[PDB]
Amino acid sequence: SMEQVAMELRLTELTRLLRSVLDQLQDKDPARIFAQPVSLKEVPDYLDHIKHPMDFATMRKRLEAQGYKNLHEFEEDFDLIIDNCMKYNARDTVFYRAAVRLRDQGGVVLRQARREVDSIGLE
Numbered sequence: 001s002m003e004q005v006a007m008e009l010r011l012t013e014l015t016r017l018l019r020s021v022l023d024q025l026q027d028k029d030p031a032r033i034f035a036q037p038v039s040l041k042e043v044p045d046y047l048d049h050i051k052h053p054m055d056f057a058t059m060r061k062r063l064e065a066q067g068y069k070n071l072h073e074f075e076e077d078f079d080l081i082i083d084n085c086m087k088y089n090a091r092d093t094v095f096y097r098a099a100v101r102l103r104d105q106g107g108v109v110l111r112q113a114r115r116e117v118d119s120i121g122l123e
């Protein structure tokens with residue numbers, strides 16, 4: 001149907017928006033601390049602590065599969081990346097602090113993303 005092609009155009013343009021957002025976000029992690037899943041080989045008890053791991057590459061595969069229906073779903077995964085990091089690592093540590101910084105940097109990128117989504121009307 002033509003309505004379905006309409007729906008796909010919107011979802012596609014949401015995806016095109018989220019790609020940009022994600023590309024900006026990973027630029028804010030030049031250490032690439034958050035680029036791949038935390039390694040269970042290197043952190044064997046990680047899953048005893050973190051029930052829902054997330055990382056940028058896992059977000060990008062969902063993105064390109066157009067599995068983000070809206071900006072909220074995308075944000076929730078971003079929050080997992082940040083929050084998981086802040087649970088496992090203590091406040092005085094360089095990991096905890098990177099997540100704080102990425103959360104703050106990221107909040108600006110996401111602030112305008114929420115406005116474009118609303119303005120261009122994609123949900």
Ligand SMILES: Cn1nc(C(F)(F)F)c(-c2ccccc2)c1N
Nearest residue numbers: 033034038039042043085088095
């Ligand atoms: C975002 N994040 N968080 C963690 C940690 F929670 F496991 F410390 C790690 C990690 C720490 C040591 C080895 C491998 C990965 C990363 N990359």
